[PDB]
């Protein structure tokens, strides 16, 4: 068995959606050490009103202050487990709800929500049921893994710049002031974790979320959360076209599941500043697409997913943490399936493992 992709079989109804709630968080720190608490947590804190308009100089401090976190390490879901672990017996929805959820990162769900219109990139999911639950976690593709060893030293530096742009826009505490000045480490994180509900698919996942705005009327999570993102400036109406049919998919897709109901843009020039800042708030995103030929549409997105974890969950029958269900994926094909067992693809760890079954 094999799933489609095509766009086509997915234009139905809107799904239903769970409105996410946080269940907690978690902060990774600058030597990428869990902390079960928000200290990794930034606020957002835009150029002082009345001031100069914002010129950020995305370059500063690379690659003298950049501390990149080690992409050779493979975490896949350990955090999230430690999470699960600490928290089993405090989760909400009653005797069981665990069991009967698909548990994984944001990121994972993003690029399932993509799928129908992803041109370029593939993707493999390693699948494992343990104790009712459904695990999804990412293996690299071989192509991946090239590409990100061949990395070119523009992607890198676009890489920080977009860390930088954060630095700018935030501030250590609340009202606050931003500072520039600091080292870029991307082994600190702010993750929120969330529950919801994709059809009849209970949902437990974790995302990274860029800040908190002080600032917000919506005080509670994760009503109150901004995602921070840049992007080249536009100039003509066939460049914001193309920027609305091909990368605000991308922010929909991620923002949207956890519930982040603002993005806030900081527009890049050639020389690597941003000179303009534009709100764009998530559920009006595919306004920009409604009536476009060459767009996308959201039902479409969720209903690939619903699809998809429909597929998964007939597919993993056997509940054993060290069984693999892989489903790979390529664009121009269906979703495959293949068995394995143990090592490598196995990615339920010992230490979850054994507390959970005793
Ligand atoms: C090697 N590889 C396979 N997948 C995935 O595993 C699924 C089932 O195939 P499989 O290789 O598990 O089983 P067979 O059909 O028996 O293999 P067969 O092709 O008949 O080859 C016979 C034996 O030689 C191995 N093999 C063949 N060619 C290569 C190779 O170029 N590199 C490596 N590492 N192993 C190879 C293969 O793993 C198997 O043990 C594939 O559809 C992929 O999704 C991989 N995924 C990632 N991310 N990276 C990989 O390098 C990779
Ligand atoms: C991928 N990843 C996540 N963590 C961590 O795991 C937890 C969950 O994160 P998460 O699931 O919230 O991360 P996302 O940014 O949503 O995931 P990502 O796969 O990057 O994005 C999903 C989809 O969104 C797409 N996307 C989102 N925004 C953009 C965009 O601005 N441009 C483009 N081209 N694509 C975008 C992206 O292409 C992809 O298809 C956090 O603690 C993270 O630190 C990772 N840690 C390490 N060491 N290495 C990693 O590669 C890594
Ligand atoms: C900005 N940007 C370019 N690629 C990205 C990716 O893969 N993930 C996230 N979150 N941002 C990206």
Not at 135 to 151: D, G, I, K
Not at 222 to 236: A, F, N
Request: charged share 20%.
């Amino acid at each position: 068995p094999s799933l489609r992709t095509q766009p086509s079989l997915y234009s139905g109804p809107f799904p239903f959606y769970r409105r996410p709630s946080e269940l907690g968080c978690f902060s990774l720190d600058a030597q990428r050490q869990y902390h079960g608490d928000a200290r990794a947590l930034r606020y957002y804190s835009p150029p002082p009103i009345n001031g100069p308009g914002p010129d950020f100089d995305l370059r500063d401090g690379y690659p003298d202050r950049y501390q990149p976190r080690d992409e050779e390490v493979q975490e896949r879901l350990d955090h999230l487990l430690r999470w699960v672990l600490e928290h089993r017996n405090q989760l909400e929805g009653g005797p069981g709800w665990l069991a009967g959820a698909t548990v994984t990162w944001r990121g994972h769900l993003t690029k399932l929500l993509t799928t129908p219109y992803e041109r370029q990139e593939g993707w493999q999911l390693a699948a494992s049921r343990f104790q009712g639950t459904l695990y999804l976690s990412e293996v690299e593709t071989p192509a991946a893994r090239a590409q990100r060893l061949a990395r070119p030293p523009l992607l890198r530096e676009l890489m920080y710049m977009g860390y930088k742009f954060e630095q700018y826009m935030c501030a250590d505490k609340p009202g606050g002031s931003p500072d520039p000045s600091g080292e870029v480490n991307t082994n600190v994180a702010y993750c929120s974790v969330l529950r919801s509900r994709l059809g009849n698919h209970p949902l437990l996942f974790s995302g990274e979320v860029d800040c908190l705005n002080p600032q917000a009327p919506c005080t509670q999570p994760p009503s109150c959360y901004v995602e921070l993102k840049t992007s080249k400036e536009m100039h003509s109406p066939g460049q914001w076209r193309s920027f609305y049919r091909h990368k605000l998919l991308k922010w929909w897709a991620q923002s949207f599941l956890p519930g982040v109901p603002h993005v806030v843009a900081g527009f890049r020039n050639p020389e690597g500043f941003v000179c303009s800042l534009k709100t764009f708030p998530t559920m009006e995103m595919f306004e920009n697409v409604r009536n476009d030929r060459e767009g996308w549409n959201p039902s479409v997105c969720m209903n690939f997913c619903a699809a998809f974890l429909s597929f998964a969950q007939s597919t993993v029958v056997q509940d054993d943490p060290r069984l693999v269900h892989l489903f790979s994926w390529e664009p121009g094909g269906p979703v495959t399936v293949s068995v394995h067992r143990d090592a490598p693809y196995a990615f339920l760890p010992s230490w979850y493992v054994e507390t959970m079954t005793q």
